[PDB]
Protein backbone atom coordinates (compact mmCIF):
# COMPACT_ATOMS: atom_id res chain seq x y z
CA UNK A 1 0.00 0.00 0.00
CA UNK A 2 1.02 3.60 0.64
CA UNK A 3 3.10 4.75 3.61
CA UNK A 4 3.06 8.10 5.42
CA UNK A 5 4.67 9.99 8.30
CA UNK A 6 2.79 11.27 11.34
CA UNK A 7 4.29 14.08 13.42
CA UNK A 8 2.89 15.04 16.82
CA UNK A 9 3.86 16.87 20.00
CA UNK A 10 5.04 14.73 22.91
CA UNK A 11 7.19 15.72 25.89
CA UNK A 12 8.04 19.04 24.26
CA UNK A 13 9.22 17.23 21.15
CA UNK A 14 8.01 16.47 17.62
CA UNK A 15 8.76 13.06 16.11
CA UNK A 16 7.44 11.53 12.89
CA UNK A 17 6.22 7.94 12.70
CA UNK A 18 6.25 6.19 9.32
CA UNK A 19 3.10 4.05 9.19
CA UNK A 20 2.16 1.63 6.41
CA UNK A 21 -1.18 -0.03 5.65
CA 3, 9, 10, 11 torsion: positive or negative?
Answer: positive
Terminal CA-CA length for the chain:
6
Which residues does residue 20 pair with via DSSP β-bridges, in sequence order?
A: 3
Alpha-carbon span 19 to 6, nearest angstrom: 8
C-alpha distances in Å from residue 9, one per residue of 1, 4, 19, 21: 26, 17, 17, 23
Alpha-carbon span 19 to 9, nearest angstrom: 17
Angle (CA) 11 3 21, round 5°? 100
Amino acid sequence: GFCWYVCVYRNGVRVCYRRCN
